[PDB]
Design a protein around this nucleic acid. Structure first.
Ligand code: MG
Ligand code: MG
Ligand code: MG
Ligand code: MG
Ligand code: MG
Ligand code: MG
Ligand code: MG
Ligand code: MG
Ligand code: MG
Ligand code: MG
Ligand code: MG
Ligand code: MG
Ligand code: MG
Ligand code: MG
Ligand code: MG
Ligand code: MG
Ligand code: MG
Ligand code: MG
Ligand code: MG
Ligand code: MG
Ligand code: MG
Ligand code: MG
Ligand code: MG
Ligand code: MG
Ligand code: MG
Ligand code: MG
Ligand code: MG
Ligand code: MG
Ligand code: MG
Ligand code: MG
Ligand code: MG
Ligand code: MG
Ligand code: MG
Ligand code: MG
Ligand code: MG
Ligand code: MG
Ligand code: MG
Ligand code: MG
Ligand code: MG
Ligand code: MG
Ligand code: MG
Ligand code: MG
Ligand code: MG
Ligand code: MG
Ligand code: MG
Ligand code: MG
Ligand code: MG
Ligand code: MG
Ligand code: MG
Ligand code: MG
Ligand code: MG
Ligand code: MG
Ligand code: MG
Ligand code: MG
Ligand code: MG
Ligand code: MG
Ligand code: MG
Ligand code: MG
Ligand code: MG
Ligand code: MG
Ligand code: MG
Lengths: 67, 144, 60, 260, 124, 185
RNA sequence: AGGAUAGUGGCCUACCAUGGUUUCAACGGGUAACGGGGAAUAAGGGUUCGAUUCCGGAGAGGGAGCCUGAGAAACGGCUACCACAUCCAAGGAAGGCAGCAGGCGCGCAAAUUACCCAAUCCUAAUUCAGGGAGGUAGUGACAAUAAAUAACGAUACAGGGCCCAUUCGGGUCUUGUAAUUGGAAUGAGUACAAUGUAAAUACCUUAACGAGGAACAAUUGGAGGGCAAGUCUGGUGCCAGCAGCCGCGGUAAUUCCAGCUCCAAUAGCGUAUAUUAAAGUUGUUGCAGUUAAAAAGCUCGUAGUUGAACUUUGGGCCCGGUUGGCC
C-alpha cells in the first residue's frame, strides 16, 4: 500500500496548516453541524427581501392581525 | 493530351468542368437540392411515426402471385399518406387501424423493393411493442 | 397490382403447424471451451473424407 | 469580448507551465505584472508543480501570505503573481535563493543561486525617452524604469539592477561577440556569441548565432538577451548550459551514465 | 407461457408496525354512495355537504352563480361544484361518476357520484 | 469541461468476412494458443500492422538519417525487449517478415505451458484468471501480458493463491471440515 | 472643409468631380452554412463532416433606445412597442431557465427538481466568505479498453506409437466417443472490518459464506448462389410467406412455418438512414466519345490555355570537410 504521510514539529502548529476535514477524521477538532447547502441558499434569499434588521418589520406584523 | 487541358496555369478550367460534370451522379444530385428534404417524405431521417388509415391488399408483381398485406400510414411531421409493409408472417392481425406506428426503409434509398409495387417503407414498431418480439411472442401488445 | 385484396389469412400457416417442444439437450460450452469443441471436430478427428471434408452430412 | 476575461482554461496555458490534462478544469491565470501572459509563470505553479512543497492550491496561500517569501526584494503576497525571466525569488526560510531561467529545452528551471548572486539581476532595456522636465529614462523588460541613466546606454542593451535602489551598476553594450541567451521561439534556451547582424530597415531584424559547438541558427531581435562578454557569464548558467544537441545523442547520455 | 417473473417471498419493510394497534388509533372512515331517482336532488346534497368546512368558500361559488344565470340553469346554485364537465351544465344531469374526498374534525368520508338515468346504470 | 480523454480501438477486421482459407487458418491459432475469440486474433494483426507502418516508412528514407536511426533503433529494441525479435535479427528488414505466430508465443498463456507449470494450453488460462502465478511480486491475472525477456525467469507461484505456500484454500477447508466432524468430534 | 468620435475614415453634413465592381464570374438567389484548430475514410492523390470538452464571433422571445462604470447598446440592468403570460378583494403589480436540475410540446432521437466546495480555479475592503463555475454520485449497451460462462485425473469397452513380440499381449509417448464417477481451483454475488471520499457508493484489499447442472443455463443472425454451414423430418401447396440481388411456393419446395443438426460473430449482434472505401462508375494523378451514353454542320474568332532556336561552355591548379575502404 503506497500512501503519503505528514509529520510536524509540534501539535499546535499542526492545527493551522492541516485542512479542517483531516482534523475530524483524527479527533483533533470537532465537526460543526451546520444546515444543508440548499437550506442556506433559501435562508440567504429570504434575508435579501428584508431591508434592515427585521424587528422594525415585525412591529408592522403585530398591527396587521389586530386591525 | 486525352482531351483534358494540361497547362501549368490552368487549374481554373479543371475545377469548373468538374462542377459541370458532378450533376451526372445520383448521390451529388440528391444532396444539394434537398430531394431527401423536400420530397421522399422522411425529412432526412432514418425512422418516423405515423397513423394507420387502412389496410391494403396489394397484389405482388409478375411472375409471382401473392398478396403482401400492406397498410396505409399517414405521417405526423408531414401528413403525407405513405404505403407501408409488414415484414413478418402474420403481424397484420397484430396491428389495427388508427395506431401509432414506427417506420423504416428497405435498403435501396427509396426505390421500391421489387415484387411489392408502390411500397418503399416497412413497419418496425406499433405503439412501442417491437413486432419482431411479437412474432417470436416475447411480450404483449397493450389494450390502448 | 390492384389495391382491394383479401385479408383473411394473415398468418394461417404459422397457426396450423404442430407446436412441438424443444428437446432437453445437455449444455454446450460457452466462449473459450466452445472453441475447444470446435477445434476437435475439424483437425483432431475428421469425420469423413469423400474427396473434400463436409461439416454437416446427411443420413445416407 | 465585452470585457476583460478573468478565467484561463486548461490547454490554453503555455507548454512551459507543464500543467497536466487531468486534475482540474481551469488553469492559473496570472495577474497584471512585470511580464506578459505567455512569458511568465505564477507563484502557484512554481511551488506545487516545480518544487512540490505545497499539494493543493489553497495550501499555497499558507506559504505566500504569512511571511518569509519575497520576490526581487519586496514581499509580493499574491497567489497568481506573474514571475518570469530573471526574477529573483528569495526565500527567507531554508536560506535558498532562486533564479528563474529557461531550460535547454525551453522550460522554467529550478536554478539555485548563492546569496551574493541573488542581490542583482539583469534587465534588457527596450527604449529610452525623455520624461517630465527633460529627464531621461530607460524601460527594462520587467517594466522597471530607471531615472537618469548612462547616455551611452542605447536600445537592446542590458543593465545590472541593484535590487535595493534603482541605480545601474553595470551595463553591457550590444555588439557582435556577446553571450546571448535566447528568450522566445523554437531556440529557447541557447547561447552562442553573435557573429554579425543583418540590418533589415523595416522591422523584424534577424541575428545570426554560432555557438561553441559550431551550430548556426537565426533568432529575431525580440529573442536577443545579452548576459555578458565573449565568455565569462555574469549569471550562473543552469545544468546543460544551453546546447540542445540531437535526440539521437540525448539517449546516449541517458543510457551510458544511468542506464548502464 | 413466459412473460414476467413471480415470487412468493414477502419483503419486510424497514419500520414494521402492529396492524391491530393502528386500527383503534385510526380515524373512522366511510365510503358512502348516493343513489336515487333522476329528479331527486342527490347532487344538490353533494354541493352542500362539500360547502361547509374547508372545501369551497364564497370566492368560488359566487362566480358559479354568474355562470348559473348565463347558461340558463339559474336554479342550479348547488350541484355544480362537484361536476365540472361540458354537456352536464347545459343539460343538468351528470354523465359519469366522480370521487371527491372529504375530511372532518373526527372521522373520514369518501362521497362518490351516481347517475340516475336508466341508460347510465352501468356508469352507476 | 476538462480535456478529452483520448481513446483508440485496438482491433481490426478483414474485408472478406467469409473465407475458407482464412477461417481455417485463424482457428488453428485459437486452438494451439487457447484464445476465446477472433477479436484477440484481430487485435494482434492490428498491432502487427502498426509496426509495418513504422518500418516501411523508414525503408524509403536515406541512411545516416537522425529520424531513421532514432525511430528505427527504438523499433528494434522494443521488439527485442519483449522477446519477439531475436538477437541475430536486428537489421530492421526482418520485422516486415515477422508473423502473427511470434507475437502469440510471447503471451503469458503459452509461456506457462512452455515453462511447465500448466498441464495444457487451456489449463493455463484457468491458472491466469484465478489469481495464480505472479510475474514478480505483482500478481497478474490477464492473459495478454506481454512477457519481456528479462521477466521470463521470474515467473513463479504467488505467496497467496494456494499450492503456492502455507494456505490450504477455500473449498478444501469445508472438505476437511466435514471429514473431521463426521468421523471425529 | 467642417461636424461627430477614445481615434483613422463619406462615419456624418455642406460644395464639387463622375466615378467604383465585373466572364480571372461582379451583383442577385439558395444553404436542413457560426468560422477555425480538427473528425471519419485509411497505397498515393482524394472525398465527406465539423451544433459540441480549445480559440475567435454572435445572441439571451422578436427589434429598438439608454443609465452606472475603465470596460455593456448588458437583458439572473432599466424603459417603450409587438408577440406570449402570471397574481388580483379587477384598484393595480410583476415576468423573461439558448444558466443547473425539472415540466409541457415537438419529435426517429437524448439523464437527478441529489451531495459538496473538499480538489480545479475565479471574484470581494480578499488565508478563514461565496461560486448549479467545477467536482462527486444516480440514470446510461453513445463509443473505447480488459475478458467469466470451466479446468485436470481415474475407469470401462475400441483404434492409432513402440520396446520385446514366445498362442490369451498390457505398458506409458499416448488422441477420442464415453447419459458410472473422483477430488480440486474459483470468481459474479453477499458480507465483519479496513481503505477510498468533504461525508458516502464503487474499485483495489480481506475474515465468515458462495457450481455439480432444475446451474450463478449466451445471445444475435444464417444454412440455393453471391457467402461459411443439410438435398435430414413434419406442416403448408403460386396460398401463407421468404427474398439487399438472381430468384423460391401446384406432392419428395437444398432458401416457407417448425424440430434436429451445423456455420459466422460473440456480451454482443441484426436492421434503417447519411457518408467513405470498393468507384480508374467523376478519372489532376487515372475514364470514355467509329458502332455500347457522348465531338457543335462548318469556318472566323477574343477572354482563357499553350508556344521554335539563341546570349559562359570548357580547361589547368591549390585547401579542407563528409561517408566508405586498408589497417
Ligand atoms: Mg453555504
Ligand atoms: Mg443582507
Ligand atoms: Mg443531359
Ligand atoms: Mg452513376
Ligand atoms: Mg414538420
Ligand atoms: Mg409536428
Ligand atoms: Mg398511400
Ligand atoms: Mg488573479
Ligand atoms: Mg492572497
Ligand atoms: Mg347527480
Ligand atoms: Mg332537466
Ligand atoms: Mg485470493
Ligand atoms: Mg476630415
Ligand atoms: Mg473620427
Ligand atoms: Mg472627405
Ligand atoms: Mg471625379
Ligand atoms: Mg453616376
Ligand atoms: Mg464603369
Ligand atoms: Mg462558370
Ligand atoms: Mg466560379
Ligand atoms: Mg461548416
Ligand atoms: Mg444556421
Ligand atoms: Mg464548430
Ligand atoms: Mg442547427
Ligand atoms: Mg450540447
Ligand atoms: Mg477579435
Ligand atoms: Mg416584428
Ligand atoms: Mg438586450
Ligand atoms: Mg435567465
Ligand atoms: Mg449574463
Ligand atoms: Mg392572459
Ligand atoms: Mg378592491
Ligand atoms: Mg389593466
Ligand atoms: Mg434546462
Ligand atoms: Mg450560470
Ligand atoms: Mg426534461
Ligand atoms: Mg419530457
Ligand atoms: Mg439515445
Ligand atoms: Mg473549493
Ligand atoms: Mg452542478
Ligand atoms: Mg454548471
Ligand atoms: Mg449506472
Ligand atoms: Mg468458492
Ligand atoms: Mg456448476
Ligand atoms: Mg449464465
Ligand atoms: Mg438460433
Ligand atoms: Mg429451416
Ligand atoms: Mg458454402
Ligand atoms: Mg425479375
Ligand atoms: Mg421438405
Ligand atoms: Mg438465401
Ligand atoms: Mg461485425
Ligand atoms: Mg500530379
Ligand atoms: Mg495508378
Ligand atoms: Mg466509364
Ligand atoms: Mg445505335
Ligand atoms: Mg451512340
Ligand atoms: Mg465532327
Ligand atoms: Mg480582359
Ligand atoms: Mg523555349
Ligand atoms: Mg566551369
Amino acid at each position: 500500500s503506497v500512501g503519503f504521510g505528514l509529520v510536524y514539529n509540534s501539535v499546535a502548529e499542526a492545527k493551522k496548516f492541516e485542512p479542517t476535514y483531516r482534523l475530524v477524521r483524527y479527533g483533533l477538532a470537532e465537526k460543526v453541524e451546520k444546515a444543508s447547502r440548499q437550506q442556506r441558499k433559501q435562508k440567504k434569499n429570504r434575508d435579501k427581501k428584508i431591508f434592515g434588521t427585521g424587528k422594525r418589520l415585525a412591529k408592522k406584523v403585530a398591527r396587521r392581525n389586530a386591525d | 493530351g486525352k482531351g483534358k487541358p494540361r497547362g501549368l496555369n490552368s487549374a481554373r478550367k479543371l475545377r469548373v468542368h468538374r462542377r459541370n460534370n458532378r450533376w451526372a451522379e445520383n448521390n451529388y444530385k440528391k444532396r444539394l437540392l434537398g430531394t431527401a428534404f423536400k420530397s421522399s417524405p422522411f425529412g432526412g431521417s432514418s425512422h418516423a411515426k405515423g397513423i394507420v388509415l387502412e389496410k391494403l391488399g396489394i397484389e405482388s408483381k409478375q411472375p409471382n402471385s401473392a398478396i403482401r398485406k400492406c397498410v396505409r400510414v399517414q405521417l405526423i411531421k408531414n401528413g403525407k399518406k405513405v404505403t407501408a409493409f409488414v415484414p413478418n408472417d402474420g403481424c397484420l392481425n397484430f396491428v389495427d387501424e388508427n395506431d401509432e406506428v414506427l417506420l423504416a426503409g428497405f435498403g435501396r434509398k427509396g426505390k421500391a423493393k421489387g415484387d411489392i409495387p408502390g411500397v418503399r417503407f416497412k413497419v418496425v414498431k406499433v405503439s412501442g411493442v417491437s413486432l419482431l418480439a411479437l412474432w417470436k411472442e416475447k411480450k404483449e401488445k397493450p389494450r390502448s | 397490382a390492384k389495391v382491394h385484396g383479401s385479408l383473411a389469412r394473415a398468418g394461417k400457416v404459422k397457426s396450423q403447424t404442430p407446436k412441438v417442444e424443444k428437446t432437453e439437450k445437455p449444455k454446450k460450452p460457452k466462449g473459450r471451451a466452445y472453441k475447444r469443441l470446435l477445434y476437435t471436430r475439424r483437425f483432431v478427428n475428421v469425420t469423413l473424407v469423400n474427396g473434400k471434408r463436409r461439416m454437416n452430412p446427411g443420413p445416407s | 469580448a465585452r470585457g476583460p476575461k478573468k478565467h484561463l482554461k486548461r490547454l490554453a496555458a503555455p507548454h512551459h507551465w507543464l500543467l497536466d490534462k487531468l486534475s482540474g478544469c481551469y488553469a492559473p491565470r496570472p495577474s497584471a505584472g512585470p511580464h506578459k501572459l505567455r512569458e511568465s509563470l505564477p507563484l502557484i505553479v512554481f511551488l506545487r508543480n516545480r518544487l512540490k512543497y505545497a499539494l493543493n492550491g489553497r495550501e499555497v496561500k499558507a506559504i505566500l501570505m504569512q511571511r518569509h517569501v519575497k520576490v526581487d526584494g519586496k514581499v509580493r503576497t499574491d497567489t497568481t503573481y506573474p514571475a518570469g525571466f530573471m526574477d529573483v525569488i528569495t526565500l527567507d526560510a531554508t536560506n535558498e535563493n532562486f533564479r528563474l531561467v529557461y531550460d535547454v529545452k525551453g522550460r522554467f528551471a529550478v536554478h539555485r543561486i548563492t546569496d551574493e548572486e541573488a542581490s542583482y539581476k539583469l534587465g534588457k532595456v527596450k527604449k529610452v525617452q525623455l520624461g517630465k522636465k527633460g529627464v531621461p529614462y530607460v524601460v527594462t523588460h520587467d517594466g522597471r524604469t530607471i531615472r537618469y541613466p548612462d547616455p551611452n546606454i542605447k536600445v537592446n542593451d542590458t543593465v545590472k539592477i541593484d535590487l535595493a535602489s534603482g541605480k545601474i551598476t553595470d551595463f553591457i553594450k550590444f555588439d557582435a561577440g556577446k553571450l546571448v541567451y535566447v528568450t522566445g521561439g523554437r531556440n529557447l534556451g541557447r547561447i552562442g556569441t553573435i557573429v554579425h547582424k543583418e540590418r533589415h530597415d523595416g522591422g523584424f531584424d534577424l541575428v545570426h548565432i554560432k555557438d561553441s559547438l559550431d551550430n548556426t541558427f537565426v533568432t529575431r531581435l525580440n529573442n536577443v538577451f545579452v548576459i555578458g562578454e565573449q565568455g565569462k557569464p555574469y549569471i550562473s548558467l543552469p545544468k546543460g548550459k544551453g546546447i540542445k544537441l540531437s535526440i539521437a545523442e540525448e539517449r546516449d547520455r541517458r543510457r551510458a551514465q544511468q542506464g548502464l | 407461457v413466459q412473460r414476467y417473473y413471480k415470487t412468493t417471498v414477502p419483503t419486510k419493510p424497514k419500520k414494521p408496525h402492529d396492524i391491530s394497534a393502528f386500527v383503534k388509533s385510526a380515524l373512522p372512515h366511510l365510503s358512502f354512495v348516493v343513489l336515487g331517482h333522476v329528479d331527486a336532488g342527490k347532487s344538490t346534497l353533494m354541493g352542500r355537504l362539500l360547502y361547509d368546512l374547508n372545501i369551497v368558500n364564497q370566492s368560488q361559488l359566487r362566480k358559479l352563480q354568474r355562470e348559473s344565470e348565463t347558461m340558463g340553469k339559474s336554479s342550479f346554485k348547488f350541484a355544480w361544484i362537484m361536476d365540472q364537465t361540458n354537456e352536464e351544465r347545459e343539460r343538468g344531469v351528470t354523465v359519469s361518476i366522480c370521487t371527491s374526498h372529504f375530511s372532518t374534525h373526527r372521522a373520514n368520508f369518501t362521497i362518490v357520484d351516481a347517475p340516475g338515468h336508466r341508460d347510465f346504470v352501468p356508469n352507476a | 469541461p476538462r480535456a478529452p480523454r483520448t481513446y483508440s480501438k485496438t482491433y481490426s477486421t478483414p474485408k472478406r468476412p467469409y473465407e475458407s482459407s482464412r477461417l481455417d487458418a485463424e482457428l488453428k491459432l485459437a486452438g494451439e494458443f487457447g484464445l476465446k475469440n477472433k477479436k484477440e486474433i484481430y487485435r494482434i494483426s492490428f498491432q502487427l500492422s502498426k509496426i509495418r507502418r513504422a518500418a516501411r516508412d523508414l525503408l524509403t528514407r536515406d541512411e545516416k538519417d537522425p529520424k531513421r536511426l532514432f525511430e528505427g533503433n527504438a523499433l528494434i529494441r522494443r521488439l527485442v525487449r519483449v522477446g519477439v525479435l531475436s538477437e541475430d535479427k536486428k537489421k530492421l528488414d526482418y520485422v516486415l517478415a515477422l508473423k502473427v505466430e511470434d507475437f502469440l508465443e510471447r503471451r503469458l498463456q503459452t509461456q506457462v505451458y512452455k515453462l511447465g507449470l500448466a498441464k495444457s494450453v487451456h489449463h493455463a488460462r484457468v491458472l491466469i484468471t484465478q489469481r495464480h502465478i505472479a510475474v514478480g511480486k505483482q500478481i497478474v491475472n490477464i492473459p495478454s501480458f506481454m512477457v519481456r525477456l528479462d521477466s521470463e525467469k521470474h515467473i513463479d507461484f504467488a505467496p497467496t493463491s494456494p499450492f503456492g505456500g502455507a494456505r490450504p484454500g477455500r473449498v478444501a477447508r469445508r472438505n476437511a471440515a466435514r471429514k473431521a466432524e463426521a468421523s471425529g468430534e
